Amino acid sequence: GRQFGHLTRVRHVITYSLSPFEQRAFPHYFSKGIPNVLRRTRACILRVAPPFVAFYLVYTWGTQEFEKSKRKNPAAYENDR
């Protein structure tokens, strides 16, 4: 109903925070962040890539398969007859 008032009931939690001025926009964003980028990227790339392979394969597979099938009329039947 009333959005902030009545949602849940919660007791004996404590919270701490600072003025945004009190702290920095990039607390080692570069150094400390780069590992975090890496670690989780693999958890996905396990389950992400495998299909993308398949298309590109088939993509070229059919591409070639398409090409010679079309490209060369005197391929199987050459122009002796």
């Binding site: 939690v13 919270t15 701490y16 001025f21 009190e22």
Partner: peptide, 12 residues
């Protein structure tokens, strides 16, 4: 002097 916040949430 600390720009900050503290909260003890107990809804009972």
């Amino acid at each position: 002097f600390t720009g900050s916040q503290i909260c003890h949430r107990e809804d009972g």
